[PDB]
Amino acid sequence: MKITVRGSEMVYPAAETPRRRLWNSGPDLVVPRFHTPSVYFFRRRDADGNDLTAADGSFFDGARMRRALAEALVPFYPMAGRLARDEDGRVEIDCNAAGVLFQEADAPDATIDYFGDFAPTMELKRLIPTVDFSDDTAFPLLVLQVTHFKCGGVAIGVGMQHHVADGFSGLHFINSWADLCRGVPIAVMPFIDRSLLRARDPPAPVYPHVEYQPAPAMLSSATPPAAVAIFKLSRAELGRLRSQVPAREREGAPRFSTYAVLAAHVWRCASLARGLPADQPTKLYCATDGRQRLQPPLPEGYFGNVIFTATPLANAGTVTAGVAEGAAVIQAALDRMDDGYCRSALDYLELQPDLSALVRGAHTFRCPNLGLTSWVRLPIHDADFGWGRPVFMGPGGIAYEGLAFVLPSANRDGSLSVAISLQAEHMEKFRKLIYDF
């Protein structure tokens, strides 16, 4: 489709902000080097047919948005900074207010329906500003593009460098930016001090942290194309999937989380689709929010990365045997993510000679392994700038196979969607397995 950029300027904070280097904790460091993409979609009508155009005739006015942005970058000032390194070469956030990129764009001939079910194909990359990554310290930490489509639809494309914050804090920012645009004040101010996640001195890990160890390889005696798709499960279908996993009665344990059950189903379908034999090890990466796992909990508004990863690992024979079998492995891995495990992780990271080596990429999630992230308890549909809530929010283009995302439904109908990337041949199979229960 045809998209032209009609305007692009750096936006700076609306007031004086602290000039300082912001220290990064271990979890702030073991993140992807380039911008993490996400996209919001908005329609001009509310499905009841109601026009969402404002009384002043506005609909995502770039000027009002840029205004509210500059304002949000005051409390959220690190978002306006750049990367940098200290004496020791440790990456940190140079809070220099070098600003965030804001672009407006037009898709003259296409409606947002061009994007269909909104699967995170690489077609979505067009909705986010292109970044020149030639210099770590050159590029802005946040780029934004508002694209206006034929028939009145709007996309907001977000590219955020994850050293500054995880998805939880990123959404806190986006939602605060929207709050201000809609004319409501920021409910929870960010708390900006990552020293709360410093390692103990001396470090004292008590687990080996399997989550940072190398992922299993295919058993031995050109990169295949990567397909991306999205699959919806109704509240009723999820209920039926759950009812297939016997409650832990004689056990006395709580029932498996819905997350563990759905994740086991996805892991199973992916492993079957990939044709893994029973003796093939496979590792699932489940990102976990440490904010409330740590004790005492971090301050409300804590601004940064607090991600700790549960990595269930089993032979494919176990995962493919049944959803119950996979769910038990997954729930056991989730259950070990307590305060002690998370603090041990901080110590483990402190002992590493090179954190950049633990960063996960295409090599981590390629067959036989898999990443699964849930956004189900994230406020991803709360970004109402004054012209309505999004009808969809998702990842903005998955470049390689082995990543899956669970997304709640915007209309609150209790449905979930699974967006996933696999090798093309495996996706062909997966399409026919995901609903086969």
How are the SSEs ordered, and which strands pair?
Elements: E1 4-11, E2 20-22, H1 26-29, E3 36-42, H2 62-72, E4 82-85, E5 91-95, E6 100-107, E7 142-149, E8 154-160, H3 167-181, E9 226-233, H4 235-243, H5 258-273, E10 281-289, E11 307-310, E12 313-315, H6 316-321, H7 323-335, H8 339-350, H9 362-365, E13 370-374, E14 392-395, E15 403-408, E16 416-423, H10 424-430
Parallel strand pairs: 6-7, 10-13, 13-15
Antiparallel strand pairs: 1-6, 2-5, 3-8, 3-14, 4-5, 7-8, 9-16, 10-11, 10-12, 15-16
Helix pairs in contact: 2-3, 5-7, 5-10
Q: Write the H/E string, N to C.
A: EEHEHEEEEEHEHHEEEHHHHEEEEH
Termini separation: 37 Å
Anisotropy-based shape: globular
Number of helices: 10
Secondary-structure class: alpha+beta
Round the Cα radius of gyration to an integer and report it: 22 Å
What is the CATH architecture annotation of the largest domain?
Answer: 2-Layer Sandwich
Largest sheet: 7 strands, mixed
| Domain tally | 2
PDB class: transferase
Keywords: hydroxycinnamoyl transferase, transferase
Assembly: monomeric
Entry title: Elucidation of the structure and reaction mechanism of Sorghum bicolor hydroxycinnamoyltransferase and its structural relationship to other CoA-dependent transferases and synthases
